[PDB]
């Protein structure tokens with residue numbers, strides 16, 4: 001009785017789900033029960049993900065607020081897409097970025113009710129403008145922004161800076177990134193001339209600096225491939241910032257995840273978001289989802305979906321307790337001791353079945 | 369029945385207590401009034417010392433210990449004549465927040481000494497001290513003899529080895545720092561310090577921003593510290609102005625465990641500010657001597673939660689919140705039939 005269930009669910013009506021096509025109600029494409037389409041507790045867009053919208057031009061305006069937050073997305077940025085900034089880049093670096101972004105988002109959404117995006121603007125002294133240096137055939141990155149070399153500079157060994165302000169959120173997730181390798185200015189430069197990308201963000205109000213230097217020696221050629229963007233994901237407080245670049249192109253945030261409304265700690269729930277077997281998936285959301293801030297839920301069957309619908313079907317009702325092992329429907333007794341339980345959780349102590357008169361035989365004239 | 373108790377406790381024998389009290393034994397068996405746990409292998413404690421004191425100052429006690437359930441028993445300084453103890457209250461809150469949070473994740477806490485490689489002739493200087501204490505972490509290295517002022521870059525290397533993570537201080541004098549006796553009264557410095565991980569390219573930086581000084585007319589200049597959790601490897605301390613500073617001691621964190629909140633009991637509320645969910649449960653127990661704590665640690669409890677400890681694992685009047693162990697239900701459940 002009251003074995004833990006492999007579902008995502010909620011303790012009460014105070015929940016919210018972020019998703020992709022498989023929860024996008026605008027119905028053969030859905031894993032989400034159609035009855036939850038009019039719930040007002042879903043932000044989902046087919047073909048998109050939080051990571052995709054965070055970094056690229058293909059943007060969906062995700063937003064939602066809830067005590068118990070659930071995620072069922074990620075797949076729309078995978079190794080099957082094979083995104084890389086440059087012809088001889090490296091998707092593995094982008095899987096790394098994915099993992100670090102989601103780890104930060106999951107961890108913070110255990111501590112805040114509200115997630116949304118804000119656009120970040122900057123003030124810059126020179127004449128140069130953004131350049132779309134990181135892109136491939138199907139995607140164009142636009143966060144961070146990269147500002148070109150000023151006309152008068154002969155090479156990329158220069159300091160450059162711009163100001164940016166974070167306002168309107170309790171905390172902001174921003175990327176701080178470098179091309180990690182021997183970056184090249186042009187093909188007119190000799191072979192042995194390369195750059196070591198350096199970027200920092202400085203909080204002018206507090207005096208705290210976050211810095212990042214390239215350390216690798218991979219390049220953007222068939223002889224020495226692997227140069228791509230390595231990103232860290234910082235949770236910053238509102239204030240006035242300075243983006244200070246010590247070498248190569250100045251970069252700074254164009255978008256932030258907006259975190260609002262602190263709550264008592266409540267772990268997020270994550271549903272594994274993958275393709276079918278014959279297409280390339282990743283487990284970056286699994287690495288990102290750790291105790292104590294996240295419960296990971298996966299099925300036992302390949303994506304071919306019956307099993308994932310029943311995992312999401314937990315969203316149609318309330319449960320007493322959400323724990324490491326799963327959801328406990330009832331609040332009283334169970335065979336398992338809940339670990340990391342939230343809600344009104346059952347005991348696994350021996351409490352027998354009680355009655356003032358125990359029944360042994362059927363009564364021919366009285367029902368039970 | 370089974371009301372939560374406002375005490376620190378343990379779920380099993382795998383616990384450890386860090387303290388600032390005397391744990392030693394002073395010696396018809398009932399004439400022996402020592403607590404059973406006197407001289408226990410599960411306690412690291414020293415009267416008139418603390419983890420913070422030993423982290424930062426010369427009167428050092430070699431605190432170390434290992435356990436699943438970690439417990440802290442918590443039983444003013446300024447660097448300069450016209451400094452500010454408020455900066456040290458803030459330092460203490462930030463130190464303990466980091467220590468408490470990380471000891472929810474590791475079994476083992478100890479101290480290591482950090483050595484450094486510096487290319488000049490200058491030596492350490494005890495610039496931060498008052499009448500009873502002398503700071504020695506971080507180390508501050510003197511200006512080189514050939515420099516006429518404190519507007520210089522300086523650096524040293526240091527290595528962190530043998531632990532999973534290391535807690536170290538990154539600090540600056542926050543205000544208008546002053547150089548020597550005979551120079552313009554309007555000539556001051558803006559202390560700037562950073563640590564750089566040479567293996568990963570990550571830099572942690574800190575610049576002074578206040579305008580306070582070290583005189584009766586303009587007091588407030590003191591040391592503001594951040595407490596970093598660093599991975600093992602090769603580092604460089606890079607100072608962009610004023611005295612080079614770098615760690616001389618680190619908290620060594622080893623042996624990961626499943627997340628298990630620490631417990632803190634007292635007797636300033638900085639340990640209270642530092643002790644927060646999800647990583648720490650704060651108890652304000654009343655009689656509160658160390659000897660009574662020792663007696664209260666002889667027996668297990670079934671469940672440790674936000675409201676307190678629940679002795680029994682079956683039923684209670686309260687729903688445990690943020691419960692660990694084997695926790696009772698408060699559901700409305702006489703002879704057993706089945």
Ligand SMILES: *[C@@H]1O[C@H](CO)[C@@H](O[C@@H]2O[C@H](CO)[C@@H](O[C@@H]3O[C@H](CO[C@H]4O[C@H](CO[C@H]5O[C@H](CO)[C@@H](O)[C@H](O)[C@@H]5O)[C@@H](O)[C@H](O[C@H]5O[C@H](CO)[C@@H](O)[C@H](O)[C@@H]5O)[C@@H]4O)[C@@H](O)[C@H](O[C@H]4O[C@H](CO)[C@@H](O)[C@H](O)[C@@H]4O)[C@@H]3O)[C@H](O)[C@H]2NC(C)=O)[C@H](O)[C@H]1NC(C)=O
Pocket residue numbers: 001330332333351352367368700701
């Ligand atoms: C912890 O809380 C739970 C939930 O509240 C509680 O479980 C309920 O216990 C009550 C009271 O005993 C049960 O109600 C009685 O059920 C008698 C019939 O029992 C059989 O059928 C039950 C109904 O099954 C249907 O519905 C359920 C879900 O609703 C579903 O799972 C089934 O598939 C099916 O659709 C069934 O629950 C029950 O199974 C339990 O008991 C058996 C036998 O001991 C055991 O083997 C199982 O493991 C399981 O525990 C069983 O198969 C019925 O005769 C009885 O009616 C008399 O009493 C009521 C008042 O109590 C009078 O109104 C009536 O006129 C009769 O005199 C009563 O309705 C209820 O079914 C339980 N619900 C569930 C989900 O298990 C536990 O007791 C709580 N535990 C503690 C320690 O507090």
Ligand SMILES: *[C@@H]1O[C@H](CO)[C@@H](O[C@@H]2O[C@H](CO)[C@@H](O[C@@H]3O[C@H](CO)[C@@H](O)[C@H](O[C@H]4O[C@H](CO)[C@@H](O)[C@H](O)[C@@H]4O)[C@@H]3O)[C@H](O)[C@H]2NC(C)=O)[C@H](O)[C@H]1NC(C)=O
Pocket residue numbers: 350351680682683701
């Ligand atoms: C949760 O766990 C606790 C701790 O184990 C448990 O509390 C204990 O309950 C038992 C059973 O009631 C208590 O023992 C009783 O003590 C009373 C008075 O002191 C006695 O009179 C009782 O004896 C009568 O009932 C017996 C039934 O077999 C008869 O044989 C006898 O003739 C008497 O009529 C009985 O022994 C015990 O005192 C407590 N312990 C504590 C520390 O409070 C509790 O019941 C558990 N609850 C649940 C819901 O499981």
Ligand SMILES: *[C@@H]1O[C@H](CO)[C@@H](O[C@@H]2O[C@H](CO)[C@@H](O[C@@H]3O[C@H](CO)[C@@H](O)[C@H](O)[C@@H]3O)[C@H](O)[C@H]2NC(C)=O)[C@H](O)[C@H]1NC(C)=O
Pocket residue numbers: 158159196197198213245246247564571606
């Ligand atoms: C992170 O990367 C940046 C960018 O490379 C580093 O800053 C740069 O440091 C280099 C090497 O110290 C400086 O170049 C040197 O200049 C001296 C003096 O002219 C010269 O003698 C050397 O041959 C060398 O060319 C460069 O000026 C400096 N750039 C800027 C804009 O400050 C930075 O040091 C790295 N950070 C860390 C902590 O290592």
Ligand SMILES: *[C@@H]1O[C@H](CO)[C@@H](O[C@@H]2O[C@H](CO)[C@@H](O[C@@H]3O[C@H](CO)[C@@H](O)[C@H](O)[C@@H]3O)[C@H](O)[C@H]2NC(C)=O)[C@H](O)[C@H]1NC(C)=O
Pocket residue numbers: 202209244520521558559560575607608609
């Ligand atoms: C944090 O603090 C350090 C130390 O103050 C800052 O580095 C220093 O910055 C000052 C002001 O930008 C630099 O002084 C300048 O010198 C040039 C060259 O003579 C001159 O053109 C300017 O008028 C000014 O006086 C100084 O060189 C620099 N010192 C070192 C050793 O790098 C640092 O910039 C601060 N960090 C941030 C993010 O603001």
Ligand SMILES: *[C@@H]1O[C@H](CO)[C@@H](O[C@@H]2O[C@H](CO)[C@@H](O)[C@H](O)[C@H]2NC(C)=O)[C@H](O)[C@H]1NC(C)=O
Pocket residue numbers: 011012013316317318
């Ligand atoms: C899940 O639990 C919440 C928690 O109460 C339920 O909220 C109630 O919703 C009903 C709508 O039928 C309102 O009339 C009540 O006022 C709500 N109760 C409270 C205490 O706010 C919700 O209905 C439950 N949902 C399901 C599907 O069982």
Ligand SMILES: *[C@@H]1O[C@H](CO)[C@@H](O[C@@H]2O[C@H](CO)[C@@H](O)[C@H](O)[C@H]2NC(C)=O)[C@H](O)[C@H]1NC(C)=O
Pocket residue numbers: 061062063116117118168258
């Ligand atoms: C995209 O989403 C954001 C966040 O939900 C919207 O911005 C909010 O708009 C409301 C007005 O209804 C303001 O009161 C809030 O202050 C805004 N929040 C933030 C964080 O900026 C925005 O309107 C949406 N964009 C579009 C085109 O619909």
Ligand SMILES: *[C@@H]1O[C@H](CO)[C@@H](O[C@@H]2O[C@H](CO)[C@@H](O)[C@H](O)[C@H]2NC(C)=O)[C@H](O)[C@H]1NC(C)=O
Pocket residue numbers: 059060061117118119
């Ligand atoms: C941040 O920028 C985005 C994209 O420019 C804004 O979303 C667009 O808003 C315009 C109107 O200003 C609409 O025409 C589009 O429908 C929106 N685009 C998408 C893809 O949703 C968004 O409003 C901005 N956010 C805030 C808080 O101002």
Ligand SMILES: *[C@@H]1O[C@H](CO)[C@@H](O[C@@H]2O[C@H](CO)[C@@H](O)[C@H](O)[C@H]2NC(C)=O)[C@H](O)[C@H]1NC(C)=O
Pocket residue numbers: 379380381666667668
């Ligand atoms: C506190 O709890 C632990 C775990 O339940 C007890 O350790 C067990 O002691 C029993 C005594 O016979 C042994 O059977 C087990 O082997 C022990 N288990 C483990 C995991 O060590 C411990 O004795 C209790 N301590 C006190 C003082 O009651």
Ligand SMILES: *[C@@H]1O[C@H](CO)[C@@H](O)[C@H](O)[C@H]1NC(C)=O
Pocket residue numbers: 123124125162163
């Ligand atoms: C950035 O802000 C600083 C301080 O507020 C100011 O000195 C500087 O002129 C600003 N830069 C630009 C380009 O607006």
Ligand SMILES: *[C@@H]1O[C@H](CO)[C@@H](O)[C@H](O)[C@H]1NC(C)=O
Pocket residue numbers: 283286287
């Ligand atoms: C992810 O996948 C790799 C194998 O590809 C495996 O070794 C690793 O343990 C997995 N991590 C998680 C968190 O599932």
Ligand SMILES: *[C@@H]1O[C@H](CO)[C@@H](O)[C@H](O)[C@H]1NC(C)=O
Pocket residue numbers: 272283286298299300301302
């Ligand atoms: C989830 O389950 C599927 C099917 O068993 C498995 O192939 C996949 O690797 C699992 N994902 C993770 C992240 O463990």
Ligand SMILES: *[C@@H]1O[C@H](CO)[C@@H](O)[C@H](O)[C@H]1NC(C)=O
Pocket residue numbers: 430431432478479
């Ligand atoms: C101090 O404690 C450390 C860590 O437990 C230990 O390795 C060292 O030997 C101790 N020092 C002395 C002098 O006993």
Ligand SMILES: *[C@@H]1O[C@H](CO)[C@@H](O)[C@H](O)[C@H]1NC(C)=O
Pocket residue numbers: 430479480481
């Ligand atoms: C650090 O230094 C102190 C004093 O020299 C010494 O007692 C202690 O044992 C040292 N730490 C270790 C791990 O040996």
Ligand SMILES: *[C@@H]1O[C@H](CO)[C@@H](O)[C@H](O)[C@H]1NC(C)=O
Pocket residue numbers: 485486487524525
């Ligand atoms: C510090 O390390 C650097 C980089 O390895 C090295 O070149 C330099 O010699 C070191 N400085 C000292 C004083 O040992």
Ligand SMILES: [K+]
Pocket residue numbers: 197198199245246247248249250251
């Ligand atoms: K840069």
Ligand SMILES: [K+]
Pocket residue numbers: 559560561607608609610611612613
């Ligand atoms: K310094």
